[PDB]
Structures are given as C-alpha cells and as structure tokens.
Amino acid sequence: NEDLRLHLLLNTSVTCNDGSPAGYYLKESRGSRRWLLFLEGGWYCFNRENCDSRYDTMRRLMSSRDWPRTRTGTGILSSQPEENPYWWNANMVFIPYCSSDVWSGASSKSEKNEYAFMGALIIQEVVRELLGRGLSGAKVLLLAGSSAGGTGVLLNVDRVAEQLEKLGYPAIQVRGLADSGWFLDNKQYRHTCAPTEAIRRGIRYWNGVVPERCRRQFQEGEEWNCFFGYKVYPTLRSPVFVVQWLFDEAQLTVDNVHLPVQEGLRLYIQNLGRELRHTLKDVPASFAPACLSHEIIIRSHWTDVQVKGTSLPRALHCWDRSLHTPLKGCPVHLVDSCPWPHCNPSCPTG
Ligand SMILES: COCC(=O)n1ccc2c(Cl)cccc21
Ligand SMILES: *[C@@H]1O[C@H](CO)[C@@H](O)[C@H](O)[C@H]1NC(C)=O
Incomplete structure (x- = not known):
C-alpha cells in the first residue's frame, strides 16, 4: 500500500533548502477528529561546506525535486490496527525533512544565502494548509517526530498550539510525541561538533528559532540550550x-x-x-x-x-486516557532501570 499522497505547499515561498517547495504526505480518515503530523529526521548541516556535501549525496533531505508522489504509512503512521494499535484510524500526515535545521529555521534562500532554512515555517504552513482540508474539525493534533524530528517536536509543539489559538481554533488540543530526540550535552568518551557547537553555528546559519519561554531563560547567544530536551x-x-x-x-x-x-x-x-x-x-x-x-x-x-x-x-x-490520578493497569511513565544495553529482553534485535 502507498497510502499517503504528496501535496507540495501552495505557498511555494516556503521551501526546502534548495528553494524547491516543501510539502507533506496526507491520508485522510473521514470521521476521525485525530490528526497525527509526523516530522521526519535526518541529522542537520550547519555551514556551506557540510550542506554542499549533504546536497550531493543526501539530496532528498534538501529538496523536493525527486520526492515520490506517495509513501506508505508505517508504524505509528500505519492505518492497519495490527501494525498501529494506537492511532490506526487517525488522519495521517508525514512531513519530509528538507530544511537540515532540526525544524528550527526561518530564513529564505537569497542574495546572501545559498540555502533556505525554513523548518519552523514549513510546520506552520503545513498546519495552515491542513486547516482547509479538515484539520479545522480536529479534537487532537499530535505533533510527532523521530530523531532530528523528535527534537523538532520539542522546538515547535508550543508554536503550533499558539498558531492555532491565534487563528481562532482554541478547541484543537495540540500535543507532542518526541521520539529519539532527547539528547545530552555531555562530554565525549574520546575527543573529536559535540552538537552544542554545531547547533550554536546552525542557529546563526539557519536563523533558527526556539520556544519563547526557553529563549527567555537562556537569552541571546545561548539559545542552543533549547535544543536539549531536559x-x-x-x-x-x-x-x-x-x-x-x-x-x-x-x-x-x-x-x-x-x-x-x-x-x-x-x-x-x-x-x-x-x-x-x-x-x-x-x-x-x-x-x-x-x-x-x-x-x-x-x-x-x-x-x-x-x-x-x-x-x-x-x-x-x-x-x-490520562488527558481525557494514575490509571489502573495503564501506565504512562515507563523508564527502564537496568544498567546495560539489552538488559531489557524486548530490545530491537538488530
Ligand atoms: C540520528 O539523528 C541524530 C540527530 O539528529 N541528532 C543527534 C544529536 C542532536 C542534537 Cl544534540 C540536536 C538535534 C539533532 C541531533
Ligand atoms: C508564505 O510563506 C511566508 C513564510 O512564512 C510568509 O511570509 C507569507 O506570508 C506566506 N504567504 C501566504 C500567501 O501565505
């Protein structure tokens, strides 16, 4: 099945790194008022040289020119209950990562800029265009994402909530699901940009934006702190x-x-x-x-x-259920305490 259909953004000024239009893949579920908007990951690039190399051999992460017209929804994006016991009946949206900015950028390609870094605006524009395709009727919008997309959720969930409020949709409950995007700014085991420096450079290169309360805590020059989940x-x-x-x-x-x-x-x-x-x-x-x-x-x-x-x-x-006191037999806080990889027998086998 190739069930999610590509829509390139109608506002073609909201672009991937190379100025091609960004977009989203959509499968509607008529009668469901749940909307899952998933942010793809794929690292990032933070200067001309490393973005040029990414453009040569990771071009789908920087351009929509070669995107397929459909994608199959898998895992949490699957519409089959056997594969997705959680949200198989939801409206499904897959937002390709083509801005290389951890979904933080608000800068256009131009005169001074070889690449556009518009991740934060791509999310905003996808939400805006979906409102006309049924999102206006939503009860829950779950902004999910994996890896750099998981960090993207943390950076953008409150902005989506604020956007929907300002646009006049206060009844849509915006929630986030950040998968594999919760990183530590720790010391390397052996020295080798430990992310902190690359993200500091990225923010300037991308015109990158962070959530407002976090920005107000860390202040100018220290917004890289807001890319760290904790x-x-x-x-x-x-x-x-x-x-x-x-x-x-x-x-x-x-x-x-x-x-x-x-x-x-x-x-x-x-x-x-x-x-x-x-x-x-x-x-x-x-x-x-x-x-x-x-x-x-x-x-x-x-x-x-x-x-x-x-x-x-x-x-x-x-x-x-908790978002309708803890629930009998239905836990939400599930953190392993055993101290070594695969001490949980159910870990993915590889
Ligand atoms: C597999 O992907 C890795 C990835 O994307 N990343 C790893 C460190 C990191 C930070 Cl610290 C912020 C945003 C993305 C990051
Ligand atoms: C297109 O997107 C840009 C970037 O967010 C924005 O400045 C502009 O207002 C948008 N235009 C329309 C017609 O939505």
Whole structure:
C-alpha cells in the first residue's frame, strides 16, 4: 500500500533548502477528529561546506525535486490496527525533512544565502494548509517526530498550539510525541561538533528559532540550550510524551563511542544510561527502554518493545486516557532501570 499522497505547499515561498517547495504526505480518515503530523529526521548541516556535501549525496533531505508522489504509512503512521494499535484510524500526515535545521529555521534562500532554512515555517504552513482540508474539525493534533524530528517536536509543539489559538481554533488540543530526540550535552568518551557547537553555528546559519519561554531563560547567544530536551521540556506548555532509548546510537555517535568493553567505556555507558534516566525522572509521559538502538516509531515492528510489560502503543493509549490520578493497569511513565544495553529482553534485535 502507498497510502499517503504528496501535496507540495501552495505557498511555494516556503521551501526546502534548495528553494524547491516543501510539502507533506496526507491520508485522510473521514470521521476521525485525530490528526497525527509526523516530522521526519535526518541529522542537520550547519555551514556551506557540510550542506554542499549533504546536497550531493543526501539530496532528498534538501529538496523536493525527486520526492515520490506517495509513501506508505508505517508504524505509528500505519492505518492497519495490527501494525498501529494506537492511532490506526487517525488522519495521517508525514512531513519530509528538507530544511537540515532540526525544524528550527526561518530564513529564505537569497542574495546572501545559498540555502533556505525554513523548518519552523514549513510546520506552520503545513498546519495552515491542513486547516482547509479538515484539520479545522480536529479534537487532537499530535505533533510527532523521530530523531532530528523528535527534537523538532520539542522546538515547535508550543508554536503550533499558539498558531492555532491565534487563528481562532482554541478547541484543537495540540500535543507532542518526541521520539529519539532527547539528547545530552555531555562530554565525549574520546575527543573529536559535540552538537552544542554545531547547533550554536546552525542557529546563526539557519536563523533558527526556539520556544519563547526557553529563549527567555537562556537569552541571546545561548539559545542552543533549547535544543536539549531536559532543558527545553520544563518550559513547554503542551503535553509531550518522550520516547528515548537509554543508549541511543546517535547519542553514542556524537559522544564518539563505537562498539570486549573495558572498564572506562563500561563506566561511560553505564553513566550515560543513568544520566538519561535521571533527566526523565520528572517526565510523566515517557517510554525509555534500556537498549542500544537507532530504531524509530515509524518502523513496522514498533509494537514489540515493552518496558515493565507495557508496549509503546499501550503507553500512548494510556496517555490519551490520562488527558481525557494514575490509571489502573495503564501506565504512562515507563523508564527502564537496568544498567546495560539489552538488559531489557524486548530490545530491537538488530
Ligand atoms: C540520528 O539523528 C541524530 C540527530 O539528529 N541528532 C543527534 C544529536 C542532536 C542534537 Cl544534540 C540536536 C538535534 C539533532 C541531533
Ligand atoms: C508564505 O510563506 C511566508 C513564510 O512564512 C510568509 O511570509 C507569507 O506570508 C506566506 N504567504 C501566504 C500567501 O501565505
């Protein structure tokens, strides 16, 4: 099945990096008032040289010129209940990542700019155009995303909520689901841009924007702090469910860890998991399995992992119920406490 159909944005000034129109893939579910808007990930680029290399061999992440006219919705974007026990009947939207800016940019290609970085405006424009295609009738808009798209959720969920309020749709409840986008600004295991520096450069290169309360806390020159979940999350007003492997492969990569493990690395990995667990202690809606993985929630077998006997589709369903005191047999805070990758037997097998 190739069930989500491409729509290029009607406002063609809201563009991918190369000035081609951004867009979204949509499958409507008539009669459902739930809307899932999913932000794709795919790292980022932060200067002319690394963006030029990405343009040569990762061009779909910078341009819509070669996008297919359809995509198949998978995992949380699947419309089959067997693959998606959570939201199989929802209106499904997949927003391709073609701005290379962690969904933070508001800058057009121009005179002075080889590339456009418009991630934050792409989300705004997708929402605006969907209002005319049924989103105006929504009861819940869940802004979800994986990896850089998961960080994108944290950066954008409250702006979507504010946009809908200002446009006159106060009854749509905006919520976020940030998958694999909750990173630590920690020390590398071995020195090698530890993300903090690349994001600091990105913000200037992209004209990148962060949520307003977080911006007001950290102030000018320090907005990179808001790309780190544990710092931006407490400032958010919308409900946000956080999914994060305790030993996320991309976190390990930026930490310069590449997997017989000796004492120093064992301690480093154990400490990483404990720090991740610590940052989620006061996140009431979370799913954080003790796995080394790069797998994301749009994979078809996303249903298989469990924490304390509860799957992510079940936890997300419990979260929905909690947003109608904790619920009998329906938990929402699911963080592993065991200290080493795959100490949870249900971790993705690879
Ligand atoms: C697999 O993707 C990795 C990825 O996208 N990233 C890894 C570190 C990071 C930060 Cl610190 C902010 C935004 C995106 C990031
Ligand atoms: C098109 O998008 C740009 C960027 O957000 C915005 O400035 C402009 O007002 C939009 N135009 C229309 C007609 O929506």
